[PDB]
């Protein structure tokens, strides 16, 4: 909670891992 | 409307999807822009 898109050709892969598996 | 053609707008080329918007842009307001510095809303020349 404390820790805070136009694609002209950057995009933003998603992680391999997700914030369920980290937990 | 609704799909992706070639527009010129007031001597304005582009190529997109044109669809109806929510922006209620001033009277003498006649092109938007995103946060991207792109054109993202117009205004048509005959119908406002
Ligand atoms: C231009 O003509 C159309 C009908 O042909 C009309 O709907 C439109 O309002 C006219 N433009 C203006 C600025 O009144």
């Known amino acids: ?8 050709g950057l995009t933003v892969l998603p992680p391999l891992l997700t914030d369920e598996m980290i937990a | 409307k609704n799909k992706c053609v070639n527009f010129n707008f007031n001597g304005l080329k582009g190529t997109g ?12 307001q006649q092109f938007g822009r995103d946060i991207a510095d ?5 205004r048509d020349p005959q119908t406002l």
Not at chain 1, 1 to 8: D, E, G, M, R, S
Not at chain 2, 38 to 42: H, I, K, L, N
């Open chain 2, 17 to 28: 999807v044109l669809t109806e918007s929510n922006k209620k842009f001033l009277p003498f």
């Open chain 2, 38 to 42: 792109t054109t993202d809303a117009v």
């Open chain 1, 1 to 8: 909670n404390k820790v805070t898109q136009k694609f002209k």
